[PDB]
């Protein structure tokens, strides 16, 4: 779909108003690019908090997997976006989510030295 492509792009580029318009015209919130990335993967990794918030309240799937098996929380975890990691955990992001290589968001935070986020993810995991 063209509409889906435009929404993926708007989310990546941080275009709050364009995301609003595309959704209003019926752009699929759960559209996928070449790499299986959803608008929420792209907004999360690029630090676009407001788009992450709108997507989650308009039905975006919080535990969507890309081709590599990564969730939006993996991506926010890897790229050091603390507010986004929190918004994802509030809306039911799975801390035990594993990529193709069996890595959790925790291990990704560990690997890229994102200390605050690794701590939040450790406390999250203990609580059922």
């Amino acid at each position: 779909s063209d509409l889906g492509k435009k929404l993926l792009e708007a989310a990546t580029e941080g275009q709050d108003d364009e995301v609003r318009i595309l959704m209003a015209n019926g752009a699929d919130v759960n559209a996928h690019d070449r790499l299986g990335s959803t608008p929420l993967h792209l907004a999360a990794k690029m630090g676009h908090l407001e788009i992450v918030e709108v997507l989650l309240k308009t039905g975006a799937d919080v535990n969507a997997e890309d081709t590599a098996g990564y969730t939006p929380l993996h991506l926010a975890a890897a790229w050091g976006h603390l507010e986004i990691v929190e918004v994802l955990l509030k809306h039911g992001a799975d801390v035990n989510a594993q990529d193709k290589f069996g890595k959790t968001p925790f291990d990704l935070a560990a690997i890229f030295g994102n200390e605050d986020i690794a701590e939040v993810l450790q406390k999250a995991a203990k609580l059922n």
């Binding site: 790499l35 990564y70 890897a78 890595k103 690997i111």
Partner: protein, 167 residues
């Protein structure tokens, strides 16, 4: 043949600036890696045996973290890399790969990570990288003489300079 690919990868890297936006990293990764590419780092066995593998959607993140780490330059020196032909893939196995990063002021530290780089390229799928496995044997941290000179009569700073960044 696969060598010119790592030529092109090094040359594109030589265009990095702090202005290099998140889109440039995706276009760099699209130019050189397959859609299902996988990147593995194996660390030296002295501070334990550590290994991570990342999928295609975080390969941009990996390269970018080297510059976030303070590198102003990155290039890969491959020494007589062994090329091998399979049906669907070409292998490049270099047991003398040096990963070179320059850092800025004040120490202008150059870091040289020596190890074995094993790559799998997809056979005319535009010769993009399917597998990247870097196994680190040892590293060297180089100091400009001018920085040694300015602290030569300074035990405090010589203590600072005498200690490695990582190990």
């Amino acid at each position: 043949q696969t060598d010119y690919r790592i030529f092109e990868l090094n040359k594109r890297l030589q265009n990095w600036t702090e202005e290099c936006d998140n889109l440039w990293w995706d276009a760099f990764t699209t130019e050189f890696f397959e859609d299902d590419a996988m990147l593995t780092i194996t660390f030296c066995l002295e501070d334990g045996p550590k290994r991570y593998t990342i999928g295609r959607t975080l390969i941009p993140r990996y390269f970018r973290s080297i510059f976030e780490g303070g590198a102003t330059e990155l290039y890969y020196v491959l020494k007589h890399p062994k090329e091998s032909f399979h049906n669907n893939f070409v292998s490049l196995d270099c047991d003398q790969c040096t990963m070179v990063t320059q850092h800025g002021k004040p120490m202008f530290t150059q870091v040289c990570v020596e190890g074995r780089l094993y790559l799998e390229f997809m056979f005319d799928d535009m010769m993009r990288i399917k597998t990247w496995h870097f196994s680190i044997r040892q590293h060297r941290e180089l100091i400009p003489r001018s920085i040694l000179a300015m602290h030569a009569q300074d035990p405090q700073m010589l203590d600072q300079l005498s200690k490695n960044i990582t190990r």
